[PDB]
Amino acid sequence: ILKLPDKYRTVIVLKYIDELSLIEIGEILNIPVGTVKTRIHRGREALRKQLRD
DNA sequence: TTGAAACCTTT
């Protein structure tokens, strides 16, 4: 329902839709898991704020 | 305001 930065949205699409794990999102995107956590947290809070149109 | 490990909580 919302288009934000490209970084935020990628990981929410990845983990929620195909139930992509965090190590999965990482090892496949070749990026640290902590980073997956931060991208997911901020994709969420950005949806929250911009779910109120 | 990014990337990332530490650090709590949920499963």
Added chain:
DNA sequence: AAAGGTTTCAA
């Protein structure tokens, strides 16, 4: 215990 979320830090 391991995955999932959060708070915090340095660049």
